[PDB]
Subunit: 246 residues, 4 copies
Amino acid sequence: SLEKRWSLEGTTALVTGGTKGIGHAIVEELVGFGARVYTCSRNEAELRKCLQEWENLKYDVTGSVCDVSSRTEREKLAEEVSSVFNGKLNILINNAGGYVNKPIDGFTAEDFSFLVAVNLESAFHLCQLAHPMLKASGTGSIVHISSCCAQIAIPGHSIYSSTKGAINQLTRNLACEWAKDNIRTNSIAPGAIRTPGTDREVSRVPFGRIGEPEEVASLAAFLCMPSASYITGQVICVDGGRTING
Amino acid sequence: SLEKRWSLEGTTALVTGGTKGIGHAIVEELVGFGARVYTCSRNEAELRKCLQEWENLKYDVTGSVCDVSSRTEREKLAEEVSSVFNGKLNILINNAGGYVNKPIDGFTAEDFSFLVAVNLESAFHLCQLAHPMLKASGTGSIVHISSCCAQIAIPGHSIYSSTKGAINQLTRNLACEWAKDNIRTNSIAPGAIRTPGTDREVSRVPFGRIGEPEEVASLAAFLCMPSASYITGQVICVDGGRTING
Amino acid sequence: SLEKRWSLEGTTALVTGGTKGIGHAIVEELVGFGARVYTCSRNEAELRKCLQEWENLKYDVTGSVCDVSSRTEREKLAEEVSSVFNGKLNILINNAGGYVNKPIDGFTAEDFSFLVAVNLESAFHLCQLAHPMLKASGTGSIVHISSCCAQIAIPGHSIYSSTKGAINQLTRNLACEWAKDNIRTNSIAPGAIRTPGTDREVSRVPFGRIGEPEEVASLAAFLCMPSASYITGQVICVDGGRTING
Amino acid sequence: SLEKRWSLEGTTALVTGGTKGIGHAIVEELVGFGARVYTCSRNEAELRKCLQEWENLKYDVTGSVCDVSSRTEREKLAEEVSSVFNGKLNILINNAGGYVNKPIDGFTAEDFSFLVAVNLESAFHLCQLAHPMLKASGTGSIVHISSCCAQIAIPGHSIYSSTKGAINQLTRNLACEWAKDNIRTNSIAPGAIRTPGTDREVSRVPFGRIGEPEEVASLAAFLCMPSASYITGQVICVDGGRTING
Ligand SMILES: NC(=O)c1ccc[n+]([C@@H]2O[C@H](COP(=O)([O-])OP(=O)(O)OC[C@H]3O[C@@H](n4cnc5c(N)ncnc54)[C@H](OP(=O)(O)O)[C@@H]3O)[C@@H](O)[C@H]2O)c1
Ligand SMILES: NC(=O)c1ccc[n+]([C@@H]2O[C@H](COP(=O)([O-])OP(=O)(O)OC[C@H]3O[C@@H](n4cnc5c(N)ncnc54)[C@H](OP(=O)(O)O)[C@@H]3O)[C@@H](O)[C@H]2O)c1
Ligand SMILES: NC(=O)c1ccc[n+]([C@@H]2O[C@H](COP(=O)([O-])OP(=O)(O)OC[C@H]3O[C@@H](n4cnc5c(N)ncnc54)[C@H](OP(=O)(O)O)[C@@H]3O)[C@@H](O)[C@H]2O)c1
Ligand SMILES: NC(=O)c1ccc[n+]([C@@H]2O[C@H](COP(=O)([O-])OP(=O)(O)OC[C@H]3O[C@@H](n4cnc5c(N)ncnc54)[C@H](OP(=O)(O)O)[C@@H]3O)[C@@H](O)[C@H]2O)c1
C-alpha cells in the first residue's frame, strides 16, 4: 500500500559526514520518514552540537567521531554501528567526500592520494564492512553521493571528477553482485549545491541557480524507500539540467 | 518543510493511457498524494469502468476517449483538460505508447509510422499543446515513459527502441528550453514490467524478476513533487539493473 | 597484414547525399582508399557536375538523382546500386539528412514529418533494402551520420536531435541483429562542421573552431576498413570535445 | 592531402607495456606508419628480446625497464624519453595496466592500492610528466587503454572497472584542459581481447568471438593521425558490440 511504500519507519541508517551540507540534510530527511540514523564527522565539537540539537527535537540520531579516510577508523565505525543497530542496517549513505581544485599540471601525489582515499576507498571499504549488516536487514539500500562532473570536464576537477567516475562504476558492480542479498545500490550526482564546502557554473545551469541540500536529500530518502524497489545501479544527476545543457 | 515537499495536494495532472498497466498505476499514485487527475484511452467501455471505480473510492479523476496518435484528438484532449482545470496544469505524464516486435528485416512502413506516431509525435505535440497550461501553473512537471531498451539492443525492438531513444533526447531539449517557465521534464525508462501489454529477459535482470507497475508509478509521482525541484533533463532507468548488468 | 587492414581496395560503397559537405568528403575519402562509390542527391545539375569532376580525376564514382525521403525512390536507388555492383555492397553511408531550427513551440507537423522522413525513415529503409547486398559482400559496414547534439540540448534542435537520437539507438539494434551476417554498424556524431548546409557554438568547443568535412570523412573510411573489424554498435563524436566540455 | 593525414611519419611515441599483448600490437602499428617508438616493461629479458626482434626488422624502437606503478621510475622514464626524442613527444599511449578478479567481498586493501596505482595514478602522472614534450611537439595525442567494462558490471571486476571508469573521466578533463596546447586525449575501451594477460563473455558478444590485439592497435594508430584532428575527449569501445548487446 502507498503508505508503507513511502515510509522509512523501523529502518536503520548510516550517513557519513552528517554535520554539514548535504549529509546534514540527508540525516534530517531520513529521520523525517522514521529512520534511526547513525552519523559521523572528524569534528568532535560540531558533532556533539548537531547531536544535541537533534535530541532536542526528539530525532533518533546517534554518532561518533570518525575520519572515513582511515581504515582503522572505518573498521571501528562499522563495529559501533553494528552493535547499536544489533547487526541490521537498512541504509548506507556514503556522503563524506573531499575536494581539490587545481589544473592537471598542479596536482600533487598527496592531492591524488587524499582524493582517492576519501572519495573512493572510503566508500568501497565501508560497503564491504557494512555488507553483513545490509544483508541481514533483508532490505538494503546503498546510496553514494557522486558528482555530475563525472560526466563532463569542469576546470580544476580532474582528479575529483575521476574519483567520482570510479564511484559511478562501483555503483554498477555493487548493484549486480549484491542484488541476490536484496541490496540495491545507486548514485546521486549533484551539480553545484549551496553548502559550507562550497558565477560561470550558474550560467551553465538552465535553472540559473545552484541547488539546495534538501534537493539532493529528498532523492536519497526516496531511493531507500520500498517504492524504489526496482531501481538499482543508476547514476541520477541532480543538477538542474547542468550536464545536458548545450 | 518536509510535508509540503512530498505532496501533490492542489495539483492537476494529465496522464495518457490510464486504464491499464503503468498508466493506471500512475493515476492512483498521483491521486494518492492529492492530485486531481485527467486521463484517457481509446476504449470507451474500459474508461467508464475505471472512472466509476475511482469515483466509488472518492478519487478526483475524470477522463475522455482519446487516441493520442490522432492530431485532432490530441487538440480536443488539450482543450477539455484546459477547460476542466481552468487553464492550469501542473503535471503531464506521456504514458500511452505502442509496441511492435519484429526483426529489422520484417518491419513495414506501416509499423514504422504507427510507432513514431504513438511513441514520439504524440508526446511531442501534447507537450506543445500543454505548454501554456504547464507554464500557467507556475510549477510544471513533464514525465515521459520511455524504455530501458533505448540504451541496449533487444531482439525485435529496433523501431520501438529508436522511438524511445528519440523521447530520451526530446527530454533534454524540453528540460532546457522550458526551464525559464519553471517546467521540469524527465524520462522514466522501465525494464520489463508486468502489464496487460506484456524468460530470457529475467535471466538478464540481476533481481531475477520483472517489475511491477507501482515500481514505475512511485518514481513518476516523486519527479512531480517539490522535492524533485532540481531534477530535470534526466533519463532514469527502472529496470532492476537490467541495462548495466554484464 | 597492415597494408590490407588499412585498405578499401576492391570494395563497393553507397554514400547518400554526396554532392556537398560531409557526403562529398566521404566519397573522396573512400575512393582514395580504392573503393568504387555510388552516390546521389536531389539536384540533377549538381550531381552531373560532381560526377564529371570525379571522372576527370579517374575516380570510380557513379550516381543518380534520388530523394531519399521518398520510399519509391529509395527502392529504385537500391535497385540500381545492386545492378551496378552485381548484388554485392561492402559499404553503406547514410549521410543525407535534413535540418530545421525552431523553438519547440514553433515546430509544425510538417517540420516533424520532414525531419523523421529524411533523418530516420530513410536510413532505416535503406538498411533494409541494402541488407541482402551487404550480407552478400561478406564484409559489410553501415555508417550513419548522426549528430553530437543527440546527447545535449542545443537551442532550436529539439526534433532534429531527437531524430538523430533515434539513429543512435538504431545503430545498436543493427549492430546486434546483423552481426551474424558479418555486418558492422556504427554512428559518427559530428559537432558543428563547415558545410554548405551550415558564434556561441565555437565558444563551447575546447578547440575553439568548427570542424572540417574531412575530419568526419576520415573516421567514416576507417570504420569501413578491416582494421575496424571489432568495432560495432558505437556512436563516436567528432566534435573537438564539444559535448564533454563543461 | 590524404597521404599526409593518414601518416605518422616523423612522429615520436611512448607506449607503456609494449612487450606483450595489446601494447606490443600498438608498437608495431605505430612504427608501421612511420613513428619512432619508445616502450617499456618490468621484465628486462623480455624487453631486450622484443627490441632485438624489432631492430632486426629495422623498426626504430627503443626502450628501458620501468615499473610504471613507481613514481621514481615514471620520472626516470619521462627523463630518458625526453632526452632520446629531444624534448618533443607526439604520442603517449598509456597501455600498461593491472588486473585482479575477485568478488567485492574478497578485495584487499593491497588489491585496491595495486589497481589504483597501475591503472590510474600511473596514467595521470605520466600525462603530467609528458605534458611539456607533448606541448612542444605542436601536435599531441594521448590515448588511454581503458576497458568496456567501465560501463557495465562484470563479475569480479569491481575495482578494475572502477579504475578504468576513472580513466574515462580523466580523458574528458585532459581533452578540455590541454586543447589549447593542441593536445588531444581519447580512451579506447576494449572488450575481451586475446592476450598473454587473458566462455560466458563470448556468449555476450554479438560477434561470438574475442578480439585480437591488432583490432585495438589500429584504432590507437588512427587516433594519433592528423585525420583524427577533431576527435578528442571520447571513449570508444572496441568490443564487437559487447556493451550494447541486450
Ligand atoms: N556541494 C557541492 O556542490 C557538491 C557537488 C557535487 C558533489 N558533492 C559531494 O557531496 C558530498 C557532500 O558534500 P558537501 O558539499 O555537503 O560537503 P560539506 O558541506 O563540506 O560537508 C561535508 C561533511 O562531511 C564531513 N567529512 C568530511 N570529510 C570527512 C572524513 N574524512 N571523514 C568523516 N567525515 C568527513 C564533514 O565534517 P568534517 O569536516 O567535520 O569531518 C561534513 O560533515 C561529497 O561527497 C561531495 O563530493 C558536493
Ligand atoms: N510494460 C513494459 O514492460 C514496458 C517496458 C518499457 C516501457 N513501457 C512503456 O510504458 C508505457 C506504458 O506501457 P504499458 O505496458 O503499461 O501499456 P499497457 O498495459 O498496454 O497500457 C497502455 C495504456 O495506454 C492506452 N493506450 C494505448 N494506446 C493509446 C492511444 N493511442 N491513445 C490513447 N491511449 C492509448 C491503453 O488503452 P487503450 O488500448 O484502450 O487505448 C492502456 O490504457 C508505454 O509508453 C510503453 O512503451 C512499457
Ligand atoms: N554540418 C554540420 O554541422 C552537421 C553537424 C551534425 C550532423 N550533420 C549531419 O551530417 C550529414 C551531412 O550534413 P551536411 O551538413 O554535410 O549537409 P549539406 O552540406 O547540406 O549536404 C547535404 C547533401 O545531401 C544531399 N541531400 C539532402 N537531402 C537529400 C535527400 N532528401 N535525398 C538525397 N540527397 C539529399 C544534398 O544534396 P541535395 O540538396 O542536392 O539533395 C547534399 O548533397 C547530415 O546527416 C547532417 O544532419 C551535419
Ligand atoms: N586483454 C584484455 O582483454 C583487456 C580488456 C580490456 C582492457 N585491457 C587493458 O588493456 C591494456 C593492455 O592489456 P593486456 O591484456 O595487453 O596486458 P598483457 O598482455 O598482460 O600485457 C601487459 C604489458 O604491460 C607490461 N606491464 C604490466 N605492468 C606493468 C608495469 N607496472 N609497468 C610497466 N609495464 C607493465 C607487461 O610487461 P611486464 O609484465 O613484463 O611488465 C606487458 O608488456 C591494459 O590497460 C588492460 O587493462 C585489456
